[PDB]
Amino acid sequence: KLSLQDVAELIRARACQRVVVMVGAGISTPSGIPDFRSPGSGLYSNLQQYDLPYPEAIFELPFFFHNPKPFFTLAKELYPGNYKPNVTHYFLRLLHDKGLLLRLYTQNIDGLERVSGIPASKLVEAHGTFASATCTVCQRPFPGEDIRADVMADRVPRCPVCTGVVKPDIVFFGEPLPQRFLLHVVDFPMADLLLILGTSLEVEPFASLTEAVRSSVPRLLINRDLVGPLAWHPRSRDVAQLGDVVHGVESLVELLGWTEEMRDLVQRETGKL
Numbered sequence: 001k002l003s004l005q006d007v008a009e010l011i012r013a014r015a016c017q018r019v020v021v022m023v024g025a026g027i028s029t030p031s032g033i034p035d036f037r038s039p040g041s042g043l044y045s046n047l048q049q050y051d052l053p054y055p056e057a058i059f060e061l062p063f064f065f066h067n068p069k070p071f072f073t074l075a076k077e078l079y080p081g082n083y084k085p086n087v088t089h090y091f092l093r094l095l096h097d098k099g100l101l102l103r104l105y106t107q108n109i110d111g112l113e114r115v116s117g118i119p120a121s122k123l124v125e126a127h128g129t130f131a132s133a134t135c136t137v138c139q140r141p142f143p144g145e146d147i148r149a150d151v152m153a154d155r156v157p158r159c160p161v162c163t164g165v166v167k168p169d170i171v172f173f174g175e176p177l178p179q180r181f182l183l184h185v186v187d188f189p190m191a192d193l194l195l196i197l198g199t200s201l202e203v204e205p206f207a208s209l210t211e212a213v214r215s216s217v218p219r220l221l222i223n224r225d226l227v228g229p230l231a232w233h234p235r236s237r238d239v240a241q242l243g244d245v246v247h248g249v250e251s252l253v254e255l256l257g258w259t260e261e262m263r264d265l266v267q268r269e270t271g272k273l
């Protein structure tokens, strides 16, 4: 049974060269963006500021077509510009820069991974993006900017061709994940270290990707709690670092000897924005 130091040492020894990373809303709470499942701030305890029967409704089509206002409020809140990446993001950026990042798979829709510098080709925005929208009736595609004014004026965007509701390319329940997700067939077998951060792993097919790495491959989770196929299918090379995500990342970063480097990076980066 490995420790956090073991995993740092594996990287330091170049025993581990191809890291895949899975992330969820928990990596973006320090940036000020609420998740679903945190107490108090999580969407589960704030259904009225939002006017949802339950959190998942915001990503369900029946409720959306019934009432697109709550989703579009969130779209307003999350629209590129608004929040900034935090240290968790820049650590992932630094992983890339250090030649370690095979791929980063993300459930988030806040775009902060793009913003932090991680190039598109290293990214799999698994649950979609605000970078583009699709008319829900005629299926005509639109760049995200084309609907920015409406979203910002609290007006439901409309198709210029058919008047249908124009929906940002966020993956809703029961919709298919985007084509890039397919990279997991070759990414996961090829990976020699799996990092999991700030997710409840409550959502498929994204969650059971944790199962797709070889048994020889350590799975390091940095999260508030033990979650998903790591809490009920524990493997022998699993490591759990439980506590604040940013705190876990800091402990790791220091073990890797990356600290001044990551501070120069965070510093230079958040300034620009």
Ligand SMILES: [Zn+2]
Binding pocket: 135, 136, 137, 138, 139, 140, 159, 160, 161, 162, 163, 164
């Ligand atoms: Zn249309």
